[model samples]
Target: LLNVEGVKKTILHGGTGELPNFITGSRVIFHFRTMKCDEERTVIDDSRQVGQPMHIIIGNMFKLEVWEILLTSMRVHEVAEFWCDTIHTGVYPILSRSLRQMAQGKDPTEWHVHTCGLANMFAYHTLGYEDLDELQKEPQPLVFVIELLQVDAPS
Candidate 1:
């Protein structure tokens, strides 16, 4: 629904399936009218180090867009391959079971599986994985940071 000065009209009628079908462009005011949680849990462990390295990964077509944005933001020249034919915006990735096993040393869990929520882990999942659970009951998954493209001299 959009309100113009005083008039109010529905731009997009609700439909079946997952929502957030609204694309209000780059400039849109959003207001959340409710905030309620279904569950509460105590933090069993709390240990974190905060640092800003200005690194981010974009998925699909948005990845190309983000690559350009980063190049402009850093004032550098780099190119990315965009295969328009294979634009997969789905819940499943091409990662195999063997590859997934190699990725974390243990079998894939719900959180690490291919889902919309875990889209960010696509790159890591595609890469080789190794498990470490048999030796340690609570196996810590292997993690890696990638520096795919970087600028040597900043202007």
Candidate 2:
């Protein structure tokens, strides 16, 4: 368990074997649910609904740096929940938009429509969704329930 800056983490189920030394280049598969930390725990995102777990390559500079650190602390079959503050989730809306686009079979990033000067405004157009948009406008702490399914080294 670790707590820092309003982020509380607990390992619900322990895993076996040694943790991966360097997750770089490794393929991690996991199921996750992001929720608002309110009484209802409104689900913000769910991997289960996609019919398959989400996959990410460690050290790939994924949007959520906290997840990378948390994943490295686990082994296969580990289940954990992390409550992260708004500061740590500032980029979640952008990340969610990208994932949602991919799920819809659309390109993760559309053609650049703005120069560097207008980057901030440009993000608004690309990262707009009812739920996520609200999250962006009003940053809030979130809870992430994650289940580690597997971790495979690069071939």
Candidate 3:
């Protein structure tokens, strides 16, 4: 009945209503924080401080696959924290690059203007964001604190 592997989530606050049968075409809204699993659980990125809660359409094939899994486990108003392994967070560097760029009011694709590829560009540490640079250089397990706000099904 429960045989899942890799990454574990601990529910801090149980949510309400039935869990979504399927995330496909649903708009999932949540507050999230990406944190390093260290003494301080250092924050990598926080949607709250970013001035908005984050929302993603299910089945959008987001860059991070683990997120979708995490979302499916939550109901509205649920607050949970997921401890994700490096295997799941392997794409963090690339995602951080895009998010940081967007935060700086620059086009996310600007990095691709004349690059061999993201791998080569990432090696140079030119992401132009300090936090992202650290994440790129030192990949580690992350703790995602999430609060599901709402879920709107496709009409």
Candidate 4:
């Protein structure tokens, strides 16, 4: 009935509907932010400087599977924060790399071919994104807060 170990979620604000319909063909729109899970809880990315909220189609073998699970559990307009352990966050650096590049009007992978996560981090040291690189170098837990703006049917 519960989810993965060490992954915790809290609803900071309530959402609509008795429950959300997240079946097949369901798409989601949301705003997300990341921060450290330590006492510092240092800010990482708050999604504002990037642009509008993110829109995504779930259940498509999403790059961040843990995130998929979290979204699936949310209600419309729900604001929730999740504390995910290192295992679930290892892919975050790569993901942030993709988002930041797209914001800059460039291809996320144009500079390099596909490769493993640790290899890219340990070998190349950094992916030109300093914050994410450090996270990769010293793996730890992270917190992701999301505002589930809407859940819509497929087009």
Scored by lDDT, the top model is 4
What RMSD does model 2 have? Answer: 3.9
Candidate 1 differs from the real structure by a C-alpha RMSD in angstroms, to one decimal, of 17.7
Superposed by TM-score, candidate 4 places the C-alpha of residue 122 at a distance from the truth, in angstroms, of: 10
Q: Cα lDDT for residue 85, model 3?
A: 74
- Minimum summed lDDT over a 10-residue window in model 2 is located at 108-117
Q: Estimate each model's TM-score.
A: 0.16, 0.81, 0.78, 0.80
Give the Cα-based TM-score of candidate 2 against the true structure. 0.81
The lDDT of each candidate is 0.24, 0.76, 0.75, 0.77
Instruction: Write model 2 residue lDDT over 1-155, tens digit each, in one string.
Output: 76456678888987776675544688888889999988999998999988778888877634436678767667778889888888889888877877776676555245442243147447555355688778888888898989988888888
How do the residues 96-127 of candidate 1 rate in per-residue lDDT, one tens digit apiece?
23233333344345545445324634545432
Candidates ranked by lDDT: 4, 2, 3, 1
| TM-score ranking, high to low | 2, 4, 3, 1
Off by over 4 Å in 3: 1-3, 60-64, 102-124
Q: How many clashing pairs does model 4 include?
A: 0
Shift of residue 124 alpha carbon in model 4, Å: 4.3
Residue 27, model 1, lDDT: 18
Q: Residue-wise lDDT of candidate 3 within 30-88, one digit each (tens)?
A: 88888998899988889889887776777753442557888878878989988887777
lDDT of 3: 0.75
Tell me how many clashing residue pairs each candidate has: 7, 0, 0, 0
What lDDT does candidate 3 reach at residue 132?
73
